[PDB]
Design an enzyme around this catalytic site. Sequence first.
Site, PDB file in Angstrom:
ATOM      1  N   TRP A  94     -18.141  -6.088  -4.286  1.00  0.00           N
ATOM      2  CA  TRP A  94     -17.282  -5.688  -5.551  1.00  0.00           C
ATOM      3  C   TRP A  94     -17.949  -4.904  -6.557  1.00  0.00           C
ATOM      4  O   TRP A  94     -17.309  -4.500  -7.786  1.00  0.00           O
ATOM      5  CB  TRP A  94     -16.285  -7.029  -5.951  1.00  0.00           C
ATOM      6  CG  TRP A  94     -15.096  -7.347  -4.977  1.00  0.00           C
ATOM      7  CD1 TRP A  94     -13.676  -6.663  -5.368  1.00  0.00           C
ATOM      8  CD2 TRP A  94     -15.108  -8.028  -3.953  1.00  0.00           C
ATOM      9  NE1 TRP A  94     -12.954  -6.985  -4.417  1.00  0.00           N
ATOM     10  CE2 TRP A  94     -13.750  -7.858  -3.464  1.00  0.00           C
ATOM     11  CE3 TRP A  94     -15.938  -8.478  -3.152  1.00  0.00           C
ATOM     12  CZ2 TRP A  94     -13.025  -8.468  -2.329  1.00  0.00           C
ATOM     13  CZ3 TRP A  94     -15.484  -9.403  -1.753  1.00  0.00           C
ATOM     14  CH2 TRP A  94     -14.324  -9.217  -1.477  1.00  0.00           C
ATOM     15  N   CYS A 101      -9.808  -6.014  -1.028  1.00  0.00           N
ATOM     16  CA  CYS A 101      -8.624  -6.618  -0.554  1.00  0.00           C
ATOM     17  C   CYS A 101      -7.677  -5.839   0.344  1.00  0.00           C
ATOM     18  O   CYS A 101      -7.175  -5.825   1.343  1.00  0.00           O
ATOM     19  CB  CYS A 101      -7.492  -7.368  -1.632  1.00  0.00           C
ATOM     20  SG  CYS A 101      -6.807  -6.361  -2.805  1.00  0.00           S
ATOM     21  N   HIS A 122      -3.482  -6.944  -6.261  1.00  0.00           N
ATOM     22  CA  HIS A 122      -4.254  -7.569  -5.107  1.00  0.00           C
ATOM     23  C   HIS A 122      -3.312  -7.478  -3.928  1.00  0.00           C
ATOM     24  O   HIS A 122      -1.848  -7.247  -4.213  1.00  0.00           O
ATOM     25  CB  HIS A 122      -4.286  -8.989  -5.649  1.00  0.00           C
ATOM     26  CG  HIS A 122      -4.718  -9.942  -4.431  1.00  0.00           C
ATOM     27  ND1 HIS A 122      -5.622  -9.427  -3.363  1.00  0.00           N
ATOM     28  CD2 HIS A 122      -4.478 -11.118  -3.911  1.00  0.00           C
ATOM     29  CE1 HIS A 122      -5.556 -10.279  -2.391  1.00  0.00           C
ATOM     30  NE2 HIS A 122      -5.136 -11.298  -2.587  1.00  0.00           N
ATOM     31  N   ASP A 165      -2.777 -13.413   3.539  1.00  0.00           N
ATOM     32  CA  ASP A 165      -3.471 -12.947   2.599  1.00  0.00           C
ATOM     33  C   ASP A 165      -4.880 -13.033   3.261  1.00  0.00           C
ATOM     34  O   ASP A 165      -5.638 -14.069   3.034  1.00  0.00           O
ATOM     35  CB  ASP A 165      -3.567 -13.600   1.243  1.00  0.00           C
ATOM     36  CG  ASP A 165      -4.358 -12.964   0.223  1.00  0.00           C
ATOM     37  OD1 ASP A 165      -5.115 -12.023   0.821  1.00  0.00           O
ATOM     38  OD2 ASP A 165      -4.582 -13.211  -1.007  1.00  0.00           O
ATOM     39  N   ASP A 180       0.743 -18.850 -15.076  1.00  0.00           N
ATOM     40  CA  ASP A 180       0.955 -18.779 -16.538  1.00  0.00           C
ATOM     41  C   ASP A 180      -0.188 -18.658 -17.364  1.00  0.00           C
ATOM     42  O   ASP A 180      -1.132 -19.140 -17.156  1.00  0.00           O
ATOM     43  CB  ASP A 180       1.966 -19.817 -17.054  1.00  0.00           C
ATOM     44  CG  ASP A 180       2.663 -19.543 -18.166  1.00  0.00           C
ATOM     45  OD1 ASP A 180       2.943 -20.642 -19.032  1.00  0.00           O
ATOM     46  OD2 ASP A 180       2.967 -18.514 -18.695  1.00  0.00           O
ATOM     47  N   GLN A 197       1.554  10.437 -22.630  1.00  0.00           N
ATOM     48  CA  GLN A 197       1.640  10.930 -21.287  1.00  0.00           C
ATOM     49  C   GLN A 197       0.445  10.957 -20.494  1.00  0.00           C
ATOM     50  O   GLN A 197      -0.572  10.338 -21.033  1.00  0.00           O
ATOM     51  CB  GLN A 197       1.683  12.592 -21.674  1.00  0.00           C
ATOM     52  CG  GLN A 197       1.736  13.202 -23.080  1.00  0.00           C
ATOM     53  CD  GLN A 197       0.558  12.989 -23.680  1.00  0.00           C
ATOM     54  OE1 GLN A 197      -0.067  14.311 -23.462  1.00  0.00           O
ATOM     55  NE2 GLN A 197      -0.093  12.119 -24.300  1.00  0.00           N
ATOM     56  N   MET A 207      -2.700  11.123 -18.344  1.00  0.00           N
ATOM     57  CA  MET A 207      -4.282  11.752 -18.555  1.00  0.00           C
ATOM     58  C   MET A 207      -4.827  11.868 -17.268  1.00  0.00           C
ATOM     59  O   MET A 207      -4.644  11.093 -16.440  1.00  0.00           O
ATOM     60  CB  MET A 207      -4.943  10.746 -19.370  1.00  0.00           C
ATOM     61  CG  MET A 207      -4.409   9.621 -19.783  1.00  0.00           C
ATOM     62  SD  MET A 207      -3.935   8.262 -18.818  1.00  0.00           S
ATOM     63  CE  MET A 207      -3.027   7.170 -20.142  1.00  0.00           C
ATOM     64  N   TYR A 236     -10.596  -2.826 -10.365  1.00  0.00           N
ATOM     65  CA  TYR A 236      -9.203  -3.262  -9.821  1.00  0.00           C
ATOM     66  C   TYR A 236      -8.987  -4.717  -9.904  1.00  0.00           C
ATOM     67  O   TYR A 236      -7.865  -5.236 -10.263  1.00  0.00           O
ATOM     68  CB  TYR A 236      -8.707  -2.790  -8.606  1.00  0.00           C
ATOM     69  CG  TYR A 236      -8.873  -3.371  -7.539  1.00  0.00           C
ATOM     70  CD1 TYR A 236      -7.816  -4.267  -7.163  1.00  0.00           C
ATOM     71  CD2 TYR A 236     -10.130  -3.598  -6.839  1.00  0.00           C
ATOM     72  CE1 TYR A 236      -7.999  -5.084  -5.953  1.00  0.00           C
ATOM     73  CE2 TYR A 236     -10.306  -4.536  -5.828  1.00  0.00           C
ATOM     74  CZ  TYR A 236      -9.342  -5.245  -5.475  1.00  0.00           C
ATOM     75  OH  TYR A 236      -9.514  -6.078  -3.970  1.00  0.00           O
TER      76      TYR A 236
HETATM   77  N1  LIG Z   1      -1.783   8.705 -15.834  1.00  0.00           N
HETATM   78  C1  LIG Z   1      -1.069   7.943 -16.276  1.00  0.00           C
HETATM   79  N2  LIG Z   1       0.149   8.240 -17.023  1.00  0.00           N
HETATM   80  C2  LIG Z   1       0.787   7.010 -17.329  1.00  0.00           C
HETATM   81  C3  LIG Z   1       0.435   5.991 -17.453  1.00  0.00           C
HETATM   82  N3  LIG Z   1       1.170   5.242 -18.143  1.00  0.00           N
HETATM   83  C4  LIG Z   1       2.133   5.785 -18.539  1.00  0.00           C
HETATM   84  N4  LIG Z   1       1.927   7.132 -18.186  1.00  0.00           N
HETATM   85  C5  LIG Z   1       2.802   8.316 -18.213  1.00  0.00           C
HETATM   86  O1  LIG Z   1       2.941   8.611 -19.562  1.00  0.00           O
HETATM   87  C6  LIG Z   1       4.471   8.775 -20.041  1.00  0.00           C
HETATM   88  C7  LIG Z   1       4.843   7.627 -20.887  1.00  0.00           C
HETATM   89  O2  LIG Z   1       4.313   6.107 -20.415  1.00  0.00           O
HETATM   90  P1  LIG Z   1       5.635   5.276 -20.465  1.00  0.00           P
HETATM   91  O3  LIG Z   1       5.081   3.858 -19.856  1.00  0.00           O
HETATM   92  O4  LIG Z   1       6.665   5.741 -20.075  1.00  0.00           O
HETATM   93  O5  LIG Z   1       5.636   4.980 -22.080  1.00  0.00           O
HETATM   94  P2  LIG Z   1       4.656   4.606 -23.165  1.00  0.00           P
HETATM   95  O6  LIG Z   1       3.501   4.205 -22.724  1.00  0.00           O
HETATM   96  O7  LIG Z   1       5.331   3.330 -23.875  1.00  0.00           O
HETATM   97  O8  LIG Z   1       4.805   5.494 -24.451  1.00  0.00           O
HETATM   98  C8  LIG Z   1       5.048   8.704 -18.626  1.00  0.00           C
HETATM   99  O9  LIG Z   1       5.189   9.906 -18.116  1.00  0.00           O
HETATM  100  C9  LIG Z   1       4.342   7.948 -17.625  1.00  0.00           C
HETATM  101  O10 LIG Z   1       4.559   8.159 -16.200  1.00  0.00           O
HETATM  102  C10 LIG Z   1      -0.907   5.586 -16.936  1.00  0.00           C
HETATM  103  O11 LIG Z   1      -1.681   4.579 -16.862  1.00  0.00           O
HETATM  104  N5  LIG Z   1      -1.501   6.517 -16.366  1.00  0.00           N
END
Ligand SMILES: Nc1nc2c(ncn2[C@@H]2O[C@H](COP(=O)(O)OP(=O)(O)O)[C@@H](O)[C@H]2O)c(=O)[nH]1
Lengths: 651, 651
Positions: free
Chosen positions: A205, A241, A299, A322, A364, A445, A447, A480
């Site tokens: 790991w 895993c 996991h 598991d 929890d 959005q 990345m 992860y």
């Molecule tokens: N690549 C990527 N896109 C993500 C991730 N989390 C959210 N998004 C995307 O970014 C946009 C907004 O995220 P969302 O979870 O809907 O809302 P926000 O994070 O509260 O603004 C959506 O198009 C998601 O699919 C992530 O961890 N990676």
Amino acid sequence: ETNGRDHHTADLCREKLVVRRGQPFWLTLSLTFSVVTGPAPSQEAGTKARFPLRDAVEEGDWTATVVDQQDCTLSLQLTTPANAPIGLYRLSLEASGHFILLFNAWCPADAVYLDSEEERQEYVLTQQGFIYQGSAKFIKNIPWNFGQFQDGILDICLILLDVNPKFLKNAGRDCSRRSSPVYVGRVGSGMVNCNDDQGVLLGRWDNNYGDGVSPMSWIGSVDILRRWKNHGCQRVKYGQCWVFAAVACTVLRCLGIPTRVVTNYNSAHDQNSNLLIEYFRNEFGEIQGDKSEMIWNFHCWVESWMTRPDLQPGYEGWQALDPTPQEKSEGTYCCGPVPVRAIKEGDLSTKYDAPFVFAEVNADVVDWIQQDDGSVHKSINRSLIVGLKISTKSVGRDEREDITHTYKYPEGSSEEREAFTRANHLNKLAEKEETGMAMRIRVGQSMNMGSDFDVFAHITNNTAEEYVCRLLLCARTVSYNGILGPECGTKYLLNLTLEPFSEKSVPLCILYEKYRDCLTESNLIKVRALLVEPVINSYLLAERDLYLENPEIKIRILGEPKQKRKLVAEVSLQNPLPVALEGCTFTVEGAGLTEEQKTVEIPDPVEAGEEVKVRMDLVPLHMGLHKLVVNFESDKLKAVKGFRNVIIGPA
Amino acid sequence: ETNGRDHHTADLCREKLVVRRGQPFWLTLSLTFSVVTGPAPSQEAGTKARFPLRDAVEEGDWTATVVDQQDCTLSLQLTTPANAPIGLYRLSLEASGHFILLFNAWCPADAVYLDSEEERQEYVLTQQGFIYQGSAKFIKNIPWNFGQFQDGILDICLILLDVNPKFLKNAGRDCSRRSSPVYVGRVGSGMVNCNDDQGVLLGRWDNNYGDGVSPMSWIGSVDILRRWKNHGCQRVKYGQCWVFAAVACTVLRCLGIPTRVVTNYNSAHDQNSNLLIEYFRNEFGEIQGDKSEMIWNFHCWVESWMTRPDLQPGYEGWQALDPTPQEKSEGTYCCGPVPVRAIKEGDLSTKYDAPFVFAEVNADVVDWIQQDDGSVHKSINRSLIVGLKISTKSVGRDEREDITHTYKYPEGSSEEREAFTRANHLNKLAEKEETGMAMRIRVGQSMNMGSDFDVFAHITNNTAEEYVCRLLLCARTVSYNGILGPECGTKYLLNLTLEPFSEKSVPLCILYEKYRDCLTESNLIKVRALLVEPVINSYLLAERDLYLENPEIKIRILGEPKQKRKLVAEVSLQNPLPVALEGCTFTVEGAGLTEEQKTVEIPDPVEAGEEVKVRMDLVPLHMGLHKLVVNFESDKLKAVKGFRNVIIGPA
Ligand SMILES: Nc1nc2c(ncn2[C@@H]2O[C@H](COP(=O)(O)OP(=O)(O)O)[C@@H](O)[C@H]2O)c(=O)[nH]1
Ligand SMILES: Nc1nc2c(ncn2[C@@H]2O[C@H](COP(=O)(O)OP(=O)(O)O)[C@@H](O)[C@H]2O)c(=O)[nH]1
């Protein structure tokens, strides 16, 4: 061979017969038959059977009724019992070859009977699938070639059984006990990573996998199973895993036990089945290191369908297995099978290992912020909820099926209350303190791996007061499984003015130059935000795991998809990095599209904007749907996946 | 018949030969051959040909070289020219039956040649697909059975050509000009809704479709084309744009012209190709009614692949054909084909109708707020951008392909500047006024048809000043084409205090009781928000089109999927409404799974929480992948779609 077509073992039935128990199979030629399976057969042990060539029937166990007699020939029907042990059998008769008997999901009396065709097709027959990864908030589906029916895999699975600890102690007992899917289940499972001599995979790991194949690189179970046998059953470097679960699934499916790989997000794994996990963070919210195990981003484990005669009636169905060994009360071993319904119900006394799986999904977490004068304050953390989006592939289609409901009752429902009571886990009084303030990490959005991007600490003040706080933001790479890497973005604000009945959004810039060095192949970064209001001395904590997207792999299928005919797959991708890619390599495979894993190296480096494209030659030998799974590897962009369903019709 | 397999016309080749031009077809038996197609054949018109049974070749046009002569038999090869007109031909020879000739996407010399197999498979052969609907911000993919190869559709398409205006004036010219896919294109297109006598569909847009089939109910082109012919070619009640495009696609595919249906969001349709559309709203932001056409939530048309000899070289490729008639300079007719690349480039002089399509995708909108003293102020509206997510189904897979890049260059790029210059559309100076304030509609999470939910006007004040404004929120049901229904939620705040460097979120509760009466089958509601700051007298406008989700239709496939074998599809859904469903009806179809559309009514009402489930019996006659598309209908929950890919192997 038309037995193959009858027993759903056609792909397996080539140069040796292979059938399923509890069902009649054709045989063509007063005498009596005899069958022997283990290396120490016996009558009462079920591993050996003697039976006459009757003309009537009278079932019970093994029978050999006659049907036709075309003068020089003789057509008859051998029938194995619904609980016949699994394995290689020797068939010989007396005056006056061999078959391999697998479990039968199609036979009503078999312990692994599956009530419907589509589910038998998915959980036993389909050789392609998905393993869910990514993050609770951005689920990724990794393609995987289980290839249980690929050439030589069945023989490897039998070798896998014949070399397990229990066969070494008493081969006779083992072969007999192989009538039980729970028994075979515990063996398949323990052989994957546990049993360290003959173990199939060696886990690692630390992100240092140079002298082997990185866990994220595997695109199917087949190559792993082969490298194992072709090196005298020595642990293959390396697995994690989902890899363990994935090969366990391949083996169990080969053997005929309906199985599916499952993923759990925010999994409380490797805590000693402890249901109340506490962390102590410093004034910047950084968990104070030691022996405390982090919650896993995700996991994986498998679920096998079978009946449970060894338990109270009514626990038939899915059983959680598991194969990842975890710290237990007396040693480190794998867990299960335990009925999933038992976990849902809080029936922790059920075998095997119920309290461990129950925890993975219900533990929890309490986050404490230690201060000056060793005073400790309980922070409010609404961002962390254990056991999140238990996923597994849908039956018959590529969509993801959420099975969270099968492990847990709705939050705060009455049935949840029952289950928690039966499990001595009534802890859920909820602090609800609510400074009226709330906070969470927002992303805006998608990345991509290779780019710079902003994320945000989003604060909500649904109150009439105006607060002046300090906000500590910190982002660091993560494996992860929870292992935090170095910081790759930090920001503090010591006099954040939060206006009444308003929201504030504070950005944190995360740069490729800062995360490129330690990011693992899972592409995860963990953003953390701690907001503290000094007056009342309140601590609000929020964290989120981001998944950076890899470039897509374009897959063109050149030519007409016909059985036994050249098929060319053109795979390509566009370099997302601001620097060049070196040592580029495409890898492809898929049961039904190739008998061999194909590889193609690219001699020259792929520059910053450039695309890489190659063509793989395939020779599909089977009709029907098959997934071509593909992996791309390079020095600075690793383990990028891609896949494409190919139909392939009549020749 | 092995010609079928050779010409990719196998499903069509049953009880009559059908082949593709520019390619040789087998015929088995000094004499000479003759072919005749129209009702007034001619030599120079290409509609008639006389040719000898040579032994060499010397192509040019039609040829009939001999290959084998198995004593009593004779095997030869007729070859049609790559530009032979399309249609029914009579074949007879002289001493000393009939075939149907279609376009050939596989022949390098044919005008419709498709460079790759996967694309020919998708755009000509696959009979299932998706029509993108929903909203720019929540795209929905509606399954659709094109079934171009279903029994009798080819004959209907020929009837469709033989009854078009141009055939009535001069049948001889028509048959001759059917050598051109652009010519056939304009005909297929015009016959769908335009040509009001023999037109295929009768459009209707008022939500009152009781005396016919609602546009949203159709689940394929087949039933439409059939109801047309079986009633003496009388317009079928009723269709809308996607339906027109969909049947146009079916016809063109049947005939062999590669075609795909495309959807454009925020489409400036039915403006007279005007590139500057202005609206005048009152003090609540309401558009002041009249003759002004609203921007369409989405609009659909088709694209056909062909070469364009009638234009400057280089315009081969996709051609946009919009069978929805719109108001033009001199009358109301459909538009195209126009090369998509021409639209991207701003080459508005290209034939046919370039300025119209250009507008659909590029028009500019200005929102004025009229006040007291007839003073008019230009509001800032960043929420509306025309031509948004041009979508069409991906080749060979179910994922959506975004083709926006093919109609437009990146915003503010140099090439965009060139195209806009060539189109006299340099209007894009951008007001950028930016009160520093911004606002948009946020939804939080998915909402379902039948439920109550909140949406939000989200205001951002990235400024040091604190403003005191008035915010007028209004939500109203809308048809997909822009027709606003009565408001179903309003909120008007007159002293909204926006704090400095802060964001505010104002909720608007939308209730089922309020939108159930006027919501159309497109499940769209349009939220509008106008924020005005009285000091500087600035107007900020924001709008968004919500799509309410329908319940999912579960589809179980009972039995083994084998050619010519009983197949049972169990379809079900759960009533999402707080009231009962009456007149429930499931409808199913899919080329390859049934020759007949199946229907099943449910006698009793389905109560508020209840599920409805039925089983349809299918008899699949073809191997390979097929989509089973399904529709659910009832009194208060209409047009809910669902689909399932079924593989179906050897018998
Ligand atoms: N690549 C990527 N896109 C993500 C991730 N989390 C959210 N998004 C995307 O970014 C946009 C907004 O995220 P969302 O979870 O809907 O809302 P926000 O994070 O509260 O603004 C959506 O198009 C998601 O699919 C992530 O961890 N990676
Ligand atoms: N049913 C439905 N869901 C929507 C719609 N618009 C957005 N969503 C979903 O609601 C969530 C947030 O919407 P998104 O557009 O990402 O962001 P927001 O609207 O700015 O908060 C996502 O899960 C979207 O898929 C819509 O019109 N209908």
